[PDB]
Amino acid sequence: GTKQEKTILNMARFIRSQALTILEKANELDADEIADIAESIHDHADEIYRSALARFGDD
Amino acid sequence: KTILNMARFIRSQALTILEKANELDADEIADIAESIHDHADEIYRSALAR
Ligand SMILES: [Ca+2]
Numbered sequence: 324g325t326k327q328e329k330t331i332l333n334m335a336r337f338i339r340s341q342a343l344t345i346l347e348k349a350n351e352l353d354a355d356e357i358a359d360i361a362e363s364i365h366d367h368a369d370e371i372y373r374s375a376l377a378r379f380g381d382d
Numbered sequence: 383k384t385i386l387n388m389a390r391f392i393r394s395q396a397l398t399i400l401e402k403a404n405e406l407d408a409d410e411i412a413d414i415a416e417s418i419h420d421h422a423d424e425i426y427r428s429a430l431a432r
């Protein structure tokens with residue numbers, strides 16, 4: 324894949340793990356709203372990661 | 383959703399958590415949220431270029 328693609332992959336992975344850290348810290352505080360947003364973020368970062376991999380070097 | 387649009391979603395949502403975390407003095411969460419936003423910016427820039 325191209326440099327752009329490798330950056331999207333690397334960034335997507337970092338966000339996924341960071342969102343997971345917020346999910347833990349938010350629920351530790353019983354901050355349900357913040358947790359739900361972090362969940363949505365994790366879902367989007369995961370989707371970017373899987374979609375980018377699925378199309379790796381294709382274009 | 384395109385990768386570009388999913389990065390846009392994260393960019394904004396990350397700053398919304400930043401704002402709500404600040405309101406709760408959840409500083410560790412706020413810092414992570416801001417870092418998430420910066421990384422989303424890179425996906426957005428890369429997806430824009432591509
Ligand atoms: Ca709880």
Ligand SMILES: [Ca+2]
Nearest residue numbers: 377378379381
């Ligand atoms: Ca493919």
Ligand SMILES: [Ca+2]
Nearest residue numbers: 378379380381
């Ligand atoms: Ca391929």
Ligand SMILES: [Ca+2]
Nearest residue numbers: 393419420423
């Ligand atoms: Ca930004």
